[PDB]
Every structure is written in structure tokens, then in C-alpha cells.
Amino acid sequence: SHRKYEAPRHGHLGFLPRKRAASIRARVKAFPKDDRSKPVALTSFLGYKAGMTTIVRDLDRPGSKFHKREVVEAVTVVDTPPVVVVGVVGYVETPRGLRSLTTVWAEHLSDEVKRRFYKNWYKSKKKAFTKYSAKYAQDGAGIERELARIKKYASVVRVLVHTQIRKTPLAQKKAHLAEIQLNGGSISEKVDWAREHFEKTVAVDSVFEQNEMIDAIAVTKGHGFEGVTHRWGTKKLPRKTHRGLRKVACIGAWHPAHVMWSVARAGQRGYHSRTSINHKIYRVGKGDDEANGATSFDRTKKTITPMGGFVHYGEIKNDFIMVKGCIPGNRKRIVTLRKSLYTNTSRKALEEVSLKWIDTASKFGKGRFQTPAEKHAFMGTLKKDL
Amino acid sequence: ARYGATSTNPAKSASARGSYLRVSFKNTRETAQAINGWELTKAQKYLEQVLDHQRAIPFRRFNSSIGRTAQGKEFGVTKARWPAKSVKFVQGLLQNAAANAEAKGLDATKLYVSHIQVNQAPKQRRRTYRAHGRINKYESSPSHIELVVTEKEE
RNA sequence: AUAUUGGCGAGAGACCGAUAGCGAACAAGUACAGUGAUGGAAAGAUGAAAAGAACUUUGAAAAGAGAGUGAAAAAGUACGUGAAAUUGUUGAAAGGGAAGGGCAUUUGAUCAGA
RNA sequence: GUCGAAUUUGGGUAUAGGGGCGAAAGACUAAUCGAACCAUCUAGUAGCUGGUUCCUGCCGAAGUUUCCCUCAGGAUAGCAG
RNA sequence: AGAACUGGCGAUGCGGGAUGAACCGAACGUAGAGUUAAGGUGCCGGAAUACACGCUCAUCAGACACCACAAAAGGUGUUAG
RNA sequence: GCCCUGAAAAUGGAUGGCGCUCAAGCGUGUUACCUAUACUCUACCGUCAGGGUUGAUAUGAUGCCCUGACGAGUAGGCAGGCGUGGAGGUCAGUGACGAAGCCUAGACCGUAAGGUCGGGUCGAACGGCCUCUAGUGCAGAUCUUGGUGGUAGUAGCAAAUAUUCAAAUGAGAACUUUGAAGACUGAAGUGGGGAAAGGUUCCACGUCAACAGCAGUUGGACGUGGGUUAGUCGAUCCUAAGA
RNA sequence: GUGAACAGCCUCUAGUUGAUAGAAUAAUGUAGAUAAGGGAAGUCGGCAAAAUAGAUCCGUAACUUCGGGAUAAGGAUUGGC
RNA sequence: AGAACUGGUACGGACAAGGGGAAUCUGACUGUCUAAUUAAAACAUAGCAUUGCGAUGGUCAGAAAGUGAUGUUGACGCAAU
RNA sequence: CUAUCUAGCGAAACCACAGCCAAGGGAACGGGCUUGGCAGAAUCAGCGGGGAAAGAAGACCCUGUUGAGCUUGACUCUAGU
RNA sequence: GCGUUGGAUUGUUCACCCACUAAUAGGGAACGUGAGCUGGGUUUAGACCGUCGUGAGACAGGUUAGUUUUACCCUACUGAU
RNA sequence: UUGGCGGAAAGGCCUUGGGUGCUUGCUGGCGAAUUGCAAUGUCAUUUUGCGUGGGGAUAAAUCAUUUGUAUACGACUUAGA
Numbered sequence A: 001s002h003r004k005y006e007a008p009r010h011g012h013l014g015f016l017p018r019k020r021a022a023s024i025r026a027r028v029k030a031f032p033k034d035d036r037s038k039p040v041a042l043t044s045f046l047g048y049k050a051g052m053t054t055i056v057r058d059l060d061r062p063g064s065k066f067h068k069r070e071v072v073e074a075v076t077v078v079d080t081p082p083v084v085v086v087g088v089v090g091y092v093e094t095p096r097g098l099r100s101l102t103t104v105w106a107e108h109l110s111d112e113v114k115r116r117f118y119k120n121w122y123k124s125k126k127k128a129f130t131k132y133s134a135k136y137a138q139d140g141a142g143i144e145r146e147l148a149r150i151k152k153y154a155s156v157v158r159v160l161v162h163t164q165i166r167k168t169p170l171a172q173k174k175a176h177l178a179e180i181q182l183n184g185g186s187i188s189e190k191v192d193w194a195r196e197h198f199e200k201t202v203a204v205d206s207v208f209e210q211n212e213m214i215d216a217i218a219v220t221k222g223h224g225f226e227g228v229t230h231r232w233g234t235k236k237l238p239r240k241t242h243r244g245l246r247k248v249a250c251i252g253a254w255h256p257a258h259v260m261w262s263v264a265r266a267g268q269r270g271y272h273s274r275t276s277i278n279h280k281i282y283r284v285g286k287g288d289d290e291a292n293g294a295t296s297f298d299r300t301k302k303t304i305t306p307m308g309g310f311v312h313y314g315e316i317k318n319d320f321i322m323v324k325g326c327i328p329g330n331r332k333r334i335v336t337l338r339k340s341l342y343t344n345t346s347r348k349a350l351e352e353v354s355l356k357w358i359d360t361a362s363k364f365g366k367g368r369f370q371t372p373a374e375k376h377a378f379m380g381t382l383k384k385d386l
Numbered sequence B: 001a002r003y004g005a006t007s008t009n010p011a012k013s014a015s016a017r018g019s020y021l022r023v024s025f026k027n028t029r030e031t032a033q034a035i036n037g038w039e040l041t042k043a044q045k046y047l048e049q050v051l052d053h054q055r056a057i058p059f060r061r062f063n064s065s066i067g068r069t070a071q072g073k074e075f076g077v078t079k080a081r082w083p084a085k086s087v088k089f090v091q092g093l094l095q096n097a098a099a100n101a102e103a104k105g106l107d108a109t110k111l112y113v114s115h116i117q118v119n120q121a122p123k124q125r126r127r128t129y130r131a132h133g134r135i136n137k138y139e140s141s142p143s144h145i146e147l148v149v150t151e152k153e154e
Numbered sequence C: 001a002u003a004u005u006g007g008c009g010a011g012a013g014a015c016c017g018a019u020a021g022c023g024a025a026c027a028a029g030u031a032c033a034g035u036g037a038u039g040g041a042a043a044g045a046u047g048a049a050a051a052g053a054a055c056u057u058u059g060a061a062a063a064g065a066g067a068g069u070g071a072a073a074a075a076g077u078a079c080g081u082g083a084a085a086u087u088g089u090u091g092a093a094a095g096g097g098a099a100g101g102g103c104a105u106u107u108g109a110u111c112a113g114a
Numbered sequence D: 001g002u003c004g005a006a007u008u009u010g011g012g013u014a015u016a017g018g019g020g021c022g023a024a025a026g027a028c029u030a031a032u033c034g035a036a037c038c039a040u041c042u043a044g045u046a047g048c049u050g051g052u053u054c055c056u057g058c059c060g061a062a063g064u065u066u067c068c069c070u071c072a073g074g075a076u077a078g079c080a081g
Numbered sequence E: 001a002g003a004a005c006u007g008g009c010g011a012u013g014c015g016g017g018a019u020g021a022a023c024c025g026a027a028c029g030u031a032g033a034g035u036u037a038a039g040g041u042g043c044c045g046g047a048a049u050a051c052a053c054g055c056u057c058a059u060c061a062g063a064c065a066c067c068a069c070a071a072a073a074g075g076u077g078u079u080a081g
Numbered sequence F: 001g002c003c004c005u006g007a008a009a010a011u012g013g014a015u016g017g018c019g020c021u022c023a024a025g026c027g028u029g030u031u032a033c034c035u036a037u038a039c040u041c042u043a044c045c046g047u048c049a050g051g052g053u054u055g056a057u058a059u060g061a062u063g064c065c066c067u068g069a070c071g072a073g074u075a076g077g078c079a080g081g082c083g084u085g086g087a088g089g090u091c092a093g094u095g096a097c098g099a100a101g102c103c104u105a106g107a108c109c110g111u112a113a114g115g116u117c118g119g120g121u122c123g124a125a126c127g128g129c130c131u132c133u134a135g136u137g138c139a140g141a142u143c144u145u146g147g148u149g150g151u152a153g154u155a156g157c158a159a160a161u162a163u164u165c166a167a168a169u170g171a172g173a174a175c176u177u178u179g180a181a182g183a184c185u186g187a188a189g190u191g192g193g194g195a196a197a198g199g200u201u202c203c204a205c206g207u208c209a210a211c212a213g214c215a216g217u218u219g220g221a222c223g224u225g226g227g228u229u230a231g232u233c234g235a236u237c238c239u240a241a242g243a
Numbered sequence G: 001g002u003g004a005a006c007a008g009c010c011u012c013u014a015g016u017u018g019a020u021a022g023a024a025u026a027a028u029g030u031a032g033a034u035a036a037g038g039g040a041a042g043u044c045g046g047c048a049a050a051a052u053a054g055a056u057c058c059g060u061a062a063c064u065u066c067g068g069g070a071u072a073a074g075g076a077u078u079g080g081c
Numbered sequence H: 001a002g003a004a005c006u007g008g009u010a011c012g013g014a015c016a017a018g019g020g021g022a023a024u025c026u027g028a029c030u031g032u033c034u035a036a037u038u039a040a041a042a043c044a045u046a047g048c049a050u051u052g053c054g055a056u057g058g059u060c061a062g063a064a065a066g067u068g069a070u071g072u073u074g075a076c077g078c079a080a081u
Numbered sequence I: 001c002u003a004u005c006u007a008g009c010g011a012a013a014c015c016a017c018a019g020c021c022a023a024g025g026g027a028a029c030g031g032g033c034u035u036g037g038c039a040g041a042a043u044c045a046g047c048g049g050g051g052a053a054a055g056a057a058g059a060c061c062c063u064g065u066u067g068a069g070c071u072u073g074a075c076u077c078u079a080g081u
Numbered sequence J: 001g002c003g004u005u006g007g008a009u010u011g012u013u014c015a016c017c018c019a020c021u022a023a024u025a026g027g028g029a030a031c032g033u034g035a036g037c038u039g040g041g042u043u044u045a046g047a048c049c050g051u052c053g054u055g056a057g058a059c060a061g062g063u064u065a066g067u068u069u070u071a072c073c074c075u076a077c078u079g080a081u
Numbered sequence K: 001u002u003g004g005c006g007g008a009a010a011g012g013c014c015u016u017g018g019g020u021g022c023u024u025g026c027u028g029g030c031g032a033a034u035u036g037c038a039a040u041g042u043c044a045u046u047u048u049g050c051g052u053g054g055g056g057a058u059a060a061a062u063c064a065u066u067u068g069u070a071u072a073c074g075a076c077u078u079a080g081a
């Protein structure tokens, strides 16, 4: 007989299977459509989620109840030191999809990216790319031949870039290497851009700008094996239930005489690849710029780092991207920020946000002071110091 | 004597056996198969490492619902264990076989475990008490173990 | 003269041959169970003869490997033979959600007849 | 729930099976109660259920008649060897 | 659910109806060859993508009896009267 | 006539499927072709029937031979045979120079029940034939007894707050002993005695195969011993309900 | 000792330290807890849980068999020195 | 029993320890039973009423007895409801 | 505290053979058969759809010329009186 | 494609009313779903009433109390090697 | 050997120059038998092993330890001359 009271199904069947992502770095499965009149540019960037904070800004939304008023908003900080371009990959199109024809690497690779090709770096002889670097022996004839092949072919061009994880406070020391599509015209000049940027750094400010809508692609925080109640949001069974209540009561009818794929089951929760779109960049700040956390309204010379450091992360010392709201992935996780795949014009995008104040109170507690100088001024002199 | 089927040279062979040994027959079979064919010194070192939990005995037949470990990877399995009692019995028999080889005058450096077989000894029977005044068997599964090490030759 | 599944003493069998024959071939109405009346098993075979393995070696030891006794240890008191289920090792072969079978032939192995 | 009296309980004693005992539930009467347990009659009877052990060869059915306290059975005739 | 006559299944395999107790064909010792039955001959699949005259285009076409469904009523759809 | 509307049901699915559109659809007609354990011919097996042949060597007249037809089968009937324990006779049968039994993807005979042989193992009896006899043939009976699997090294060994360090002993110590520490029972005890009951569990020595669902050097275990002393404590005596 | 108390809790004498252990800390469990705002809307049903609770003082209705109801209901206070 | 002082207004600080009220049905109450699914409104109960019986008797036992229970009793009793 | 992993120890239920589906037909709800979909070793923790899962020769209903407990001017008797 | 509700009474399916809402559509899946729960009802045994029966007892009449067992196997599914 | 073209899976196509072999374009000389009257009468490509010569290169992964962005266990993700 029928369900006898309608309810929406629990969970989204389009995010199946709820299995662990095959890699800790979520793959970018779609790049922005190529407009071949614009200059050559990366379609994405690699960063490390540092943590969240809060900002105050005047809302610009005519017709809204809070128009020209002050709104407090949550923001996520992504430590984004410049990425080192170390190679180029050419992609030809086939009746069976895109296919990598050849990859041309830079002559010199840093130990950061070399560690990525090693499970046991400490006891290896570090022979990686030693014979490849010999292709630059006298004139780089083989490198030029491969680049000529990429120009003659490879309707899609991607650069291989790696993070400078040594500039982050992470203990990993092993760089993250990824392919970033080169948008802009003339595959020939895509290859020229890649070759000219071999062994060179590209900063996040050359990829992204303020008020831009971007997408965050990351593996979510893992939670291990989870019951249906929290994995799918199913109703808790009554307290009277024998054999447990954090379950689904009926996991299927008599026919089909099988548990169906659509029924909520206990299993792995979190550590899933997610691509969340339309996150507005609130700041493109620079590590070399002190007063990173300052605004035109605050003028207090302070960095983006909260007092005591970002909890479980450390201090931001590099370029950083501050996006509105929250993004998938936990602190210290590698995330990929990609340009939006469409042109959003909705007055939520295209809104020019000007931060009035960035919170730098300690996230290790109920932080009361934005700066150590402010703590000094409020508290007065102490016994130890001050 | 009258061991199981062997195809090696008895003059270059040394035997050892233990009957009615109160050790899990299944665990002991896995332990014996772990060192079947190995050189004697290599097998003894491996059994010591197993006792130390540095390497594992891969459970291939009697392995249902046991558990998974990374130490089975070197044998290309996921299910391996550390049956210390079986290892102790098997290595005692290995020491006895090495002693018999030395008495026979065989070269210890050329010795490898050419035959090792574990089969079921008669069960030793105990009783366990069950709900509603029921009584069920609580038997042991002891092992007859035999092995012979032969000189490697051509 | 007739009766006689008790008792005593005898002679027999187209009877049974240790799950049979009495429940009991054996320390069987025993061990054991039940408050009790009662209920009531399982359990035979080394070898001609213990000649039941001295002595050496490994092991803490049980035992093992030798040596030896014996016609035989493929008879070692867990003992005549020693099946099947089930099992270990070795050898051979096959194996995409059973396996097994029938007809026919290929291939491999193996073999009789002339 | 009750907890100082129709109280709880040890030991001794009496009541024994169509009998006992029951502030009554067919409750209890040695894990047995709308008639205990034990042995024998007893291998109780069963139109009812299950099983019923070698091969090959030849022939080869019936579920229909009548009667029955008969309707899951039998006798009778028919079919078969 | 109940009768009549017959043929069957039960008790029966075999070829066909994909599949099926009963339908079609045909009843059966072990084999060889030939010819067929019913049924089929694009491929599965053995056997003519055979021949010939027409009809049908379906945004739910239709495609072999038992048999696994379809009706009244309608349509310048198309065809022939 | 064909096609279309009429024509709505529940897991995804059925001209059998694929697929097919001057069809591989529908109506009709003509051929060719495919193939049943059916039909025709032949061979062989058996059955039944009708016959020939004691005129001898020529022992198989229940034999040999000729001819024709036939063969489905549950329940069931009958017939001819295979096999088992025991019995009378016979082969002056086999056998410690190896009987019986058992194992044997080794061989041979029979349509089959089965029979025979080779090899291995083994150790003391056994077989062919003519008859006699029956407690004579197993796949079943939630069959009986015994044995053994998969499950499966799985379920589990999670109540009673809790153990830790060192040394000794020992082959071996999470569990034994001593010490140190931390705890608990908290006098209605996890203390000290008894009644019923048990019967040596008491204690010492030795000692670990089995038992103590891990372990064990320890034990209410195993082996050997020691131990229970009354005029006054009881029984014994009295009577109680009752016998 | 606290306390009305042979309650609960801690300790002295005495006894024990006996329950297979080691490592991790997923789901679901068993046992024990907490929870913003709402407050039975849950459910057959307030099941379960929570709330109350000792003592002192005040105050105590209907009804009544005059004995009760009654700790009715409802309030206040409580340490140390 | 009271007073002063004192404190993050805490104080039966752990432990221990009633939720209450307005009613309805029902059994008066205390008590008892289906050990092992029913604790109840069921049973019992005090109270009330009825019945039989003055002993060579009422009620009830026993196979029978020169046998028994009430009865070491006597209607303010015993027995049956 | 489990579950979980490990050392040691180590059962039971159940078991024709087993284990992927859709439809068909079929004893009218197949794991096997037919036609399709498909289909790659060995596995771990969970799980409660299915195995018309297990537990028990249905306890309800009917039949049996099978009972038993109980009742009554059923039939036929009987202790007592 | 997408949604189709919160509640009072009732075990209830059904019904009815209050209310919100875009709407409060109808159904299937062994009248989906008990080794998922629960157990209020029906439908064991206790008990009460009414009617019926001489009685034991009957009652799609009412009322109250009344044990919801097992997955560790295979597959399916969820995750994991 | 010269040069060019071919990326959809190019792994091939086209072309330059010379060397050398054959040429059935035409005309000669010699040989063939006996595999016995047929017997595929062995002529292909597919992997691997091994030996002999020549050229070329001189790592990792796992376990153990560690990390917690991970986690039941595996696995994941980090670090360590």
C-alpha cells in the first residue's frame, strides 16, 4: 500500500556513492569555456584552507532591508602562495574524449615537487627527472620538438603547477601538483606562455580579483563510518524501539526482493569530493603587505592572522584569498579555486564589497582583543610583563 | 617414520615431527604453509619476526572473518595473523630438524624446508554450558606436525 | 505315564559372530541418573614370544632423529586388518554469478589387444 | 507492593493420584497437573502420515457399477496379469 | 461447479507451440542411410534477405490456432467497392 | 480492408530476443529447402509366432537352424537372471612361495544386477559348480547407533569499580610467592563461627598429562601421606504434633 | 564519623584484590548523563525521563463513617563563625 | 531558641529524599492467587442472611470393623451455603 | 562496557544442491527451467529486502465411526442411603 | 519533474472536525514494510456485566489484565581492502 | 639512403640517389625419377627459455617507525640517512 503520508526523500542521489574520494585533492572535472580572444591565463589556483573569520561590511543591495547598512559575514581564508609552473600538457580531441598527447616539463624541478613522485623520499636516491633534465643539454632540441608537437596538436592546453607547501605552516613538505587549463587564444601562445613560465611563480592576484565569483573544489572533512541518522538525516526511531533506534525501520518492500540503491544505509561520511560554486572573493591579500587585516575604515596595522594564529593551521605569510561564507574541506586541506563556469549577473554577483573590518580576535576561545597592543591597552600592566 | 608423501633424497634429508600437540590445527596449517619451501635459516628468522609482530603469517584457507593487516601485503593477501603458539611449535620442530641434520652430517647452509604438513590430531573434548540447560562440545583441534629439511643440490 | 524361560549336572545346533547374540563375551545389573519406585550403558583382537625399543643425539620436558627387537614397527600397549565421511602435503588439471550430467569430437595423460 | 501480625521462615509432623491440598488460578501436588511419577498389560488400536533394500524381459490398468454408521475406508462388478 | 460422446494427460518420452501434464505432429529396443510430419528457412538457428500480386507508416504499428485479451462508436488517413 | 482515436497501474522487459518498413508486417498463390525416438531399406538385441532337424561320429533336441512380425509405460502381475549369510554333494578346487578383506581417472566380459584379472596393502582362511535354506541386497523412513563436516578460527570468553612496580622461583610468569603501591568489601562485610548438605574438599610433601571455557611454576586438580583425643559440648534421656 | 537511622557515603580490625588479557575509540547497541526555544504538539496511553523530596516555622479546602482527608493544597527558612 | 558578623545570596551544597490537584468506574479496607505471559474489578475478609442437627444426631470418612473426623465438641456449638 | 584489531580459547542454530536479476510459463509469487539482461580472483565491517530464512509433524478450521476435562431426567449402570 | 502537511476524538483502516497551505490527489509494491519497531485492537489461558442456556457453557455484544525469540551464513544493499 | 607528409588508435603513406640480386620480355643447355597409384605430407605466426656476439642504464616499493587533514581493520594522508 501507499506511503500514507508524503515526505521528500532523505539525501541527494546525485552525490552517490557516499564513498571516500580517491584522492585528498579533489579533481577539477570542468574548466571555464575557452574564450580565445582574452590573454592567456590560468583557469584555477591551488591553496590551503587556513580557517574562517568574520568581517563587517556595508551591504550594497538596493531594495533590501539592510541596504547601506552594516552586515557581519563569515569568510574563509585560503593561504595561496604563488604556484610554480613546472610543465605543460597537450590534449588532443578523439572520438573517445580528450587524450594527453605529450607533456613537456621544466628543466629544473624543486625538491617540493620532486617529493610528490616519491613514497620514501628520505631513503631514495632522488633520481627523478635526472635524465629528463638532460634533454636541455645543448639547445633543448627535444623540448622544442615536443612543444612544436603540442602547438601542431592539442586543442586543449593545461599547465602543470605545484604549490610551495614550504611557504605554508604545514608539516607536509610535499608539494601538490595539478593541471590548470590555460584559457586565452592561440594554442601556440598557450604553449609559449607555459614555456616562458617554466620554473616561474604565478601569483593568485594574476588569476583572481576582488568581487569575483569563484568555485571551491575540495575533499570534505572525513567522519569515518556513520549511521543513517547523521549520514542521511533520517528520522530517529522512537525510544521504545528494540534493536536500536538510529536506523531506518523499513529498508525495502517485499518486492523487489532486494535492498534498493535508494535506501539509506550506514557507511562512510565525509571525505567526499565537492565543487561548491558562487563564492565571492572578499580579499586577494598579500603576505608581503603588512596590515593584511586592515581596511580603509580600520587603519589598524594588523595581518589577517588571528591572535595566537589560525587554530590548527598557523600564521598566514603568503598571498591569501578571502571568500564569503564557507567552502568544502577542513583546515590544512589543499583546495582548488577555479573561475566560474558561467557569467553570473544577479546583483549578488557584480556587487562590489568593501570590507570595513576584519576580525583578528583569537579563534582559540572567546577572543576579546584584535591586537596585542589592544590587549595591552585594555588590561594595563601585568606582573610578568607590560 | 612413515611421513607424508615426499620426493626428496632421504640421505640428504632430516626429519622432525610432533604428535597430539595442543595447538590450533588451522593456525598451525597456516604457519606451516607460510614456511613451506623456505630455507631453514630464513624461515627461522621469519618466525622470530612473526613472534615480534614485524611480519605476519598469511591466512589463506582458514581465514574467514579474521581481520586485515598491512603485513600480509608482502604475500599479496589482506588476511594475515600472528599465531604465536603455532609458531612456537613449528620453530621447536624446526630446531629439532636442524639438530637431526647436524647429527646426520648435513650442511646447515644448504638446508631448506622441503616438506611440512599439519593434519588434525584426535580432538580433546570439553563441555560448555548453554542457555536453557543445554550442553555443547568445547573441543580442541590439536595438530600432528611433521617436516623434513633437505640439502639444496642439483 | 504328564508339566517345567527357576535351580543343579550334561550333550547338541543348517542359530548369532561384538551396532549381532542375553542389557551384560570385558571388575554388567557394573559405571552413571533419579528423592524414590525404578532406569541403565559404553567397553573384545600388538606380537609366536615383550623380544614393550638398551645406547647415542636435540629438547626444560612431552617427544623427535637415529640405533635396536621382531617375520613384519606398513604390529610401538593412542597397538591385527584398517573402509567411508572429513583432512594435510605433494602432483596434475579446470575455474567471468554454482557444480555435477548426456551425445560427439579436439587436446593432454594413460592402457589393452595384434 | 508490603514491612509488627491473615507477617516471614528453619526443623519435625500429617494429608498421595480420580486421591490430596486449594483466601479458588483448574492453581499446587519434586522443571511433570483440566488427574503426578514409576513398571507392566504393551510390539495397546489406527479406515491416518512416513518409509519399504538387486537387474533385465513380457504384458499392463483404475479413479467407474451396486451395497455399506459409506463420503480419506471396504465389499462387489468392471479394467489387468 | 455438474453431466453426454470421443480423444488424451495421469501412466509418455520424442519433433513443434520460446517457455507449459493435456494443443499440433508423432508414440519410443540399439544403430546407419534416405524421406517427411507439425512447425519453420534475416541473425540468434538448421533451412530462399525466394518468387509473385496487392495492402499498411502507427509520437502506444504489426507479426500465427490452444494462448496468454480488447468493444461500442468514430476518422477527405489510405485502398477497393 | 489495413492504419489511427476510443485504449488508464503500479520493480525494468518482452511478436522468445535482436531487429525488421516495395518487411524480416498483413492477405494470398507457387516452388525450393531444414529436420522427430514417425515412415522406407538394412544390420544387431530381445520377445512372440509358425516351422525344419536323433539317419549316424554329432557331447549343447530345454540343442542347432529356417521364416515372419513385433518392442512406450506408473500402479500392478508374471518370467529369466545377478548378489549375500549358512547347509548336503562335488572340483582328491585356491592358499603363509600369501586366504579373506581393503585401496587402485589400470585391463577384460555382461544390456544390467555383476563377474574376472593386474598392481599396492595384508595376514589365515576361502572359492567355482549341482542342489538346500533364510534374520539375503537400502538413498531416503524429522529412521537407529557411531563417526565426521561446512558454519568457523566464527558467535563469543564485556554484570559484581582495579590494578601497577620490582625481586624470587621456574624452560616458560598478566595470573605463583615475597615486598612496595593503589583500591574494595565498610561490622545487615568480600570479616569470625555454625545448622542442613557434602565427605577429606582440612594440612604437609611431591607435582602439572587431563580439569580450573586465557594462562599457570598455582589450586577445592593429580600422586602420596598426616590429621578429628570429652564424665562436663552434643547425641544418648524426656515428651510435642504425630508414628 | 556524617546522619533519625542496622539508609546511603568514607574509614578501623579482619579479608580480598578473584572474574581471559593487550591495542584502538567506526557504525549500531547496553548502562549512565546533558541540552537553546517550545512544553505532551509525541504516543493507544506522559511509556520513559524530569520535576518534588530531609528538617524547622507558617498555612491547609471539599468531603467525611468525625476516626480522617493531611506531608492536603501552598509558602518561608537552612552554611560558617 | 535568639542575635551579630561573614560569603560570587551560598548552605537537607555529595549522599539521602513525596510531584500535586478536580473528578469518574470499580472493589469497602489490611490480606491472597495463576512458581515460569494475567495481581485484577478475581479470591478471602469482617458484617448480613438462609439451611441441617438435641447425640440411637447433623455433616463427612472407611473394603470392613468391637473403625473413624467435627469431638478435650453441645445450638453464644458444629456442619452446609 | 561491547562491537572492532590482536594473543590464547573456542561452540551453536541451520545445511537436498546451492546462491545476481527482469519477464514468461509453471502447483496460478523461481536460485535453477525459457528468452533476454549480464557476468572477473580472494575478501572486511555493517545491514535487515529476500532465502515464501530458523524455531515446532498448525495450537485456529475440517475430517477420524481417535480421546480427554466438565455438564445434564442422553443411554446403561453404580457406592451410599 | 516536483510537492501533497500540523492537530482534537477513535486501537482503528475508515470517519469527522480545527488549522495552515500552492495543494492538503487517488493508489500499488505478499491488502509493501513485526529476526524494523510498537502491541492500543482482534484472537489462548484470569476476571466482570448484559442476553441466552437446567447446566457445563455460548455470544462479528461490551469491559479489564495478559512473555513480540535467533542472523555470525548466502545473496541484495551500504560503505572498505 | 634523400626529403616530405601522416596524432582519431598517427606506427603508415609518398619520395630521392646509388649499390646489389632476380626477371618468364624473347631464345637456348643441363637437373628432377624410387615420396614407388593418394595420404597437410610439414614452407605460416605466437609467446617464452637458453646460449653466443654487440650496444645501453645503474631504482624503487612494501613492512617496521612516525603524522592525524584519515581511520572499525585494511586503506588514506604525512615525516624520517
Ligand code: MET
Binding pocket: I060, J043, J044
Ligand atoms: C483465528 O484467529 C486463529 N488464528 C486462532 C485465534 S486464537 C489466538
Ligand SMILES: [K+]
Binding pocket: D034, I068, I069
Ligand atoms: K484433560
Ligand SMILES: [Mg+2]
Binding pocket: A002, A003, A004, A005, A006
Ligand atoms: Mg502518496
Ligand SMILES: [Mg+2]
Binding pocket: none
Ligand atoms: Mg547537516
Ligand SMILES: [Mg+2]
Binding pocket: A240, A241, A242
Ligand atoms: Mg521493547
Ligand SMILES: [Mg+2]
Binding pocket: A311, A362, A363, A364, A365
Ligand atoms: Mg575557536
Ligand SMILES: [Mg+2]
Binding pocket: B064, B065
Ligand atoms: Mg565474510
Ligand SMILES: [Mg+2]
Binding pocket: B065
Ligand atoms: Mg565479527
Ligand SMILES: [Mg+2]
Binding pocket: B128, B129, B130, B131
Ligand atoms: Mg554458557
Ligand SMILES: [Mg+2]
Binding pocket: B132, B133
Ligand atoms: Mg540449569
Ligand SMILES: [Mg+2]
Binding pocket: none
Ligand atoms: Mg551387545
Ligand SMILES: [Mg+2]
Binding pocket: C045
Ligand atoms: Mg579393534
Ligand SMILES: [Mg+2]
Binding pocket: C072
Ligand atoms: Mg604384516
Ligand SMILES: [Mg+2]
Binding pocket: C082
Ligand atoms: Mg591398526
Ligand SMILES: [Mg+2]
Binding pocket: none
Ligand atoms: Mg577419504
Ligand SMILES: [Mg+2]
Binding pocket: none
Ligand atoms: Mg565474484
